[PDB]
Amino acid sequence: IVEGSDAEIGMSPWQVMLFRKSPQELLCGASLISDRWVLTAAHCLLYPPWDKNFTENDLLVRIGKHSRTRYERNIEKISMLEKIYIHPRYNWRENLDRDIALMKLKKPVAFSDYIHPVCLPDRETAASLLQAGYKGRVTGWGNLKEGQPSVLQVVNLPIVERPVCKDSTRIRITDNMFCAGYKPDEGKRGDACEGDSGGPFVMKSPFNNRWYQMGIVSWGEGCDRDGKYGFYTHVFRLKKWIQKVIDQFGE
């Protein structure tokens, strides 16, 4: 995260670190949506142009973390993957359209002060909150500049008008994406950066005081560039697929 701040303890209890087993490194963010399901970006797991195609045994998820590097004894929980599900129409060839994946945990993670699921939005929650100028929140252990944080970083960013997103980039944008970030003339700054992909873009509903994950950190050209914006997977637009997977393969 660029131009963010240190998260407070338990501020983002749905935060998940996707962690490579060997070499032991941070791959991406992710989020906890139930005691056995984790949501992330497809591109964190599958990206053929770079020979990326992780299997379940290549990866762990670490849940309940604050410090990036430390083993947070008695606080974090580390889970093995039972199964990875990548959206069947994820477009890695062109523009990362439908950049979404689910990971089913071998065993349920125990909730705690530091571990708790985020809500996924309904149609009405999306319609109310996904409006230009409305701010969401992005969290991650990614780089601080286009170097690395000691603890989880947080930044709040405004959703951007769709024409402005389109005109910022040569990449073909789809209805399964939205962009967020401040304009050059807004003064304030901030963005996700390397290592933040797959983590959540959340909003707190003013109707029911609950946090909903509206986006997944998907792609951006550099980090925190003037006239450029972060692009996020539109979670509600793909919720039918999410529910399909969970309904079929959930226990």
Binding site: R62, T69, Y71
Partner: peptide, 10 residues
């Protein structure tokens, strides 16, 4: 960079 995690997880 990263502290060793317990080998049970690996």
């Amino acid at each position: 960079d990263f502290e060793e995690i317990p080998e049970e997880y690996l």
